[PDB]
Design a binder for this molecule. Structure first.
Ligand SMILES: C[C@H](Nc1ncnc(N)c1C#Cc1cn[nH]c1)c1nc2cccc(Cl)c2c(=O)n1-c1ccccc1
Length: 816
């Protein structure tokens, strides 16, 4: 019985559990235990949660940041439905109060015992809040569509819970003896690093010939006392050749995870190259066989652990804040004590002057860290940055981070996961925290898994991600079932796309399309492809898959197009997803995630650019899912101006198009939608650098809202300036050649959107800092990020920045 599970875990996480054991690594062994029971006691807690507390776990709310409204309401055991009229300002209960009395009359005669399940979705309606504060309601009301809810009893929501049954004396210089290696001449650079910059000095070595397997036994000496290496400090090797050609690199913690200094001899299996790399990880390559190892000797010292801590309890400027000439590092460190007293939110600037190479400053720096008032989240995001490796800051950072909402957590989740690659050991506070939150919220649970599942093909993180995944599973056995269902859909889809690629090679679109439909209609594909939660959205219920509607785009990686339909969800149950295999999909997810962040900040200052935030989810190696936006066409299609329709100038295709989708008065609103979304995405794509936009990767929806697809290009990689296209300019202007009233309302939208993002310019900056961890080729250098500072123009005055933004815009009308 524990063997079925372990086995289902191996399947699910993409690595066999037996590969852990088989490592005889003690660090990994107590990781697996200290975490198995954090997680099971977490689940313990879970199966005794109250019923509403269960709803808040399995189906956490969806929420937006005077008039009336129609709502069909059901019950479980039946199909009889009543329509209502409630306003947008009622609570969920008014509805339920009113829902039972129209029953208490048919069945011929207590609203607090209930919840409104949205229909054919794992979404529910309950709480403090008005009706239109809800993400579904304020959404059905635009679409003007009737909400369809279900009165689900407390007895029913406990039934589901039930189902989910589970020292400092050493003052000589530190040095290593080099030994052998196993792949002109050969060089071996080595630095002592803490975070970003180095403690000691650069230390090359004896030259040898590429005649190698080489042997060095040169005693390599480092410029720093031993009593003064910090608790971290990573030692950082690098192997090249000249008469410079990079070869491999390798890092390692100078201390045991269990705290003690590292002696004495060990073997370093190195990762290759492309030139000395403090940021790569401090575990070694799994490729044992192929891998160039390096062997060194970490010398002896008597069993010196690293001192616990009541015994580091030992001990006009401000044209300053928010790079130095550090004839100013002084006054910062000098009067550090009332930095803490009178300026707490500059903790970071301080750590970035603290001496890590000498333990007296560190002990003193840490001394102010424990008394430090906690920070605002924006600040804690800063401290996660690589250049604050320190266990303690990271503890402080995590400490200040518990004041996150599950909503903001979900909003920064992709970065926090990237941060997991910096961590120097396995059992860190961030991991404990993420699993804590994840186990405590099933939407968080969902997306944490997939952020990890999607990287198990990358050797540098397969072990850690694997390890956490398994823990998550030990604490959520049921949710493991639901994720298998998903991973199997994706397994099959992949096979089906392989077939579609191959088949399309030798035959026509109707033939391959009709062939695919049979592949699908096999018993095995119908079972796998149906009746699962959507990896893109766990409240979306992919149920009965419509094969007649499935197709594939006749382009290079032949993405698939899968429609679905729930009968107990009606029209809002007919949804689709896109399978794409071939491309790395992490670039887009980042882009769509940031854009969605833009729509939140704008909405939080009362500005709705009617944006369009479709899910994008990478699931595996160059493989992931994209969410389908029904009722939408590419501009490029629309502008082909074909015959059929009911356009004398190509300029008018788009507008005519718009007209035919919105006759009578509805064309007013669509133009408006159009104008708003076009302001959003124009500013979105200008701030972010999104390149070569053309009518093939811009889509418009019948409502009018336009949105962008295919985000390959990013942060102005080929300075990307503002773009305004004549033919949306022509739609904005309702047809007219000279509609300055409608066009400048449009310029304002843009200016507002731009200024609102500028006041959070720092959030985006902190968030792009952490993503540097992600290996995204168009996001690695220090000055890919300066693109975002000169976009946001964050170093100018608000009246000045908007001066220059105004130049950029005006030059972009001028193209048309
Ligand atoms: C370009 C269009 N794309 C999206 N359509 C809606 N909703 C989205 N979410 C996306 C998307 C996307 C995307 C791709 N890369 N990054 C994001 C699209 N993508 C496809 C992908 C695979 C297979 C097919 Cl058969 C199609 C397909 O027919 N269209 C399409 C073309 C014109 C009119 C309607 C549909």
């Amino acid at each position: 019985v524990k063997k079925l599970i372990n086995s289902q875990i191996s399947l699910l996480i993409g690595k066999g559990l037996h590969e852990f054991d088989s490592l005889r690594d003690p660090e990994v062994n107590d990781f697996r235990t200290k975490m198995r029971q954090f997680c099971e006691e977490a689940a313990a807690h879970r199966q005794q949660l109250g019923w509403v507390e269960w709803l808040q776990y399995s189906f956490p709310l969806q929420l937006e940041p005077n008039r009336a409204l129609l709502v069909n309401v059901k019950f479980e055991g039946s199909e009889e439905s009543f329509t209502f009229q409630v306003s947008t300002k009622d609570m969920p209960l008014a509805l339920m109060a009113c829902a039972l009395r129209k029953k208490a009359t048919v069945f011929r005669q207590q609203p607090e015992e209930y919840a409104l399940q949205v229909n054919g979705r794992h979404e529910y309606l309950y709480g403090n809040y008005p009706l239109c504060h809800f993400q579904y309601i304020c959404s059905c009301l635009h679409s003007g569509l009737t909400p369809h809810l279900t009165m689900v009893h407390s007895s029913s929501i406990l039934a589901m819970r039930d189902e989910q049954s589970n020292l400092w004396s050493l003052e000589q210089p530190f040095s290593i003896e080099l030994i052998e290696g196993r792949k002109m001449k050969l060089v071996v650079q080595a630095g002592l690093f803490h975070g970003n910059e180095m403690l000691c000095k650069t230390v090359s070595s004896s030259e040898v010939n590429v005649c190698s397997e080489p042997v060095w036994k040169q005693r390599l000496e480092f410029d720093i006392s031993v009593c003064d290496l910090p608790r971290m400090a990573r030692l950082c090797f690098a192997l090249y050749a000249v008469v410079d050609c990079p070869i491999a690199w390798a890092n390692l913690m100078l201390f045991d995870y269990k705290d003690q200094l590292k002696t004495g001899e060990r073997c370093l299996y190195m990762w290759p190259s492309v030139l000395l790399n403090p940021a790569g990880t401090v575990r070694g390559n799994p490729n044992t066989e192929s891998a160039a190892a390096l062997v060194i000797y970490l010398p002896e010292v008597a069993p010196v652990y690293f001192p616990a801590l009541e015994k580091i309890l030992e001990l006009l400027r401000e044209i300053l804040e928010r790079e130095l000439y550090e004839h100013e590092k002084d006054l910062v460190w000098k009067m550090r004590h009332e930095v803490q007293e009178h300026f707490p939110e500059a903790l970071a600037r301080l750590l970035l002057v603290t001496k890590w190479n000498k333990h007296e400053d560190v002990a003193q720096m840490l001394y102010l860290l424990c008394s430090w008032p906690e920070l605002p989240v924006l600040s804690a995001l800063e401290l996660l940055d690589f250049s604050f490796p320190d266990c303690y800051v990271g503890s402080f950072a995590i400490k200040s981070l518990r004041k996150l909402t599950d909503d903001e957590l979900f909003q920064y989740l992709l970065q926090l996961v990237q941060v997991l690659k910096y961590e120097s050991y396995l059992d860190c506070e961030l991991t404990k925290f993420l699993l804590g939150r994840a186990l405590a919220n099933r939407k968080i649970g969902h997306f944490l898994f997939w952020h990890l599942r999607s990287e198990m093909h990358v050797p540098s993180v397969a072990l850690r991600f694997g390890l956490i995944m398994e823990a998550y599973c030990r604490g959520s056995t049921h949710h493991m079932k639901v994720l298998m269902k998903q991973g199997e859909a994706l397994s099959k889809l992949k096979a089906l796309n392989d077939f579609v690629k191959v088949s399309s090679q030798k035959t026509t679109k109707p033939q391959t399309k009709e062939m695919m439909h049979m592949c699908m209609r096999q018993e095995t594909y119908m079972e796998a492809l149906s009746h699962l939660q959507s990896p893109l959205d766990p409240s979306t219920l992919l149920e009965e898959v419509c094969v007649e509607q499935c197709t594939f785009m006749d382009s290079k990686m032949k993405p698939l197009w899968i429609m679905y339909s729930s009968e107990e969800a009606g029209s809002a149950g007919n949804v689709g997803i896109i399978f794409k295999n071939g491309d790395d999909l992490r670039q887009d997810m980042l882009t769509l995630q940031m854009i969605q962040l833009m729509d939140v900040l704008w909405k939080q200052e009362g500005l709705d650019l009617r944006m369009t935030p479709y899910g994008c989810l990478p699931t595996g190696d160059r493989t992931g899912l994209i969410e389908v936006v029904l009722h939408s066409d590419t501009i490029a299609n629309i502008q082909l101006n074909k015959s059929n329709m009911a356009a004398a100038f190509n300029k008018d295709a788009l507008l005519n198009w718009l007209k035919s989708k919105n006759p009578g008065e509805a064309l007013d609103r669509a133009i408006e939608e159009f104008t708003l979304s076009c302001a959003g995405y124009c500013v979105a794509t200008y701030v972010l650098g999104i390149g070569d936009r053309h009518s093939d990767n811009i889509m418009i929806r019948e409502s009018g809202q336009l949105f962008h697809i295919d985000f390959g290009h990013f942060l102005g990689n080929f300075r990307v300036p503002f773009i305004l296209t004549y033919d949306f300019v022509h739609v904005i202007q309702q047809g007219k050649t000279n509609n300055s009233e409608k066009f400048e309302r449009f310029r304002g939208y843009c200016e507002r959107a731009y200024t609102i993002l500028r006041r959070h310019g720092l959030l985006f900056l902190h968030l792009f800092a952490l993503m540097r961890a992600a290996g995204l080729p168009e996001l690695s250098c220090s000055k890919d990020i300066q693109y975002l500072k000169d976009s946001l123009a964050l170093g100018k005055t608000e009246e000045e920045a908007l001066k220059h933004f105004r130049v950029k815009f005006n030059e972009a009308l001028r193209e048309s």
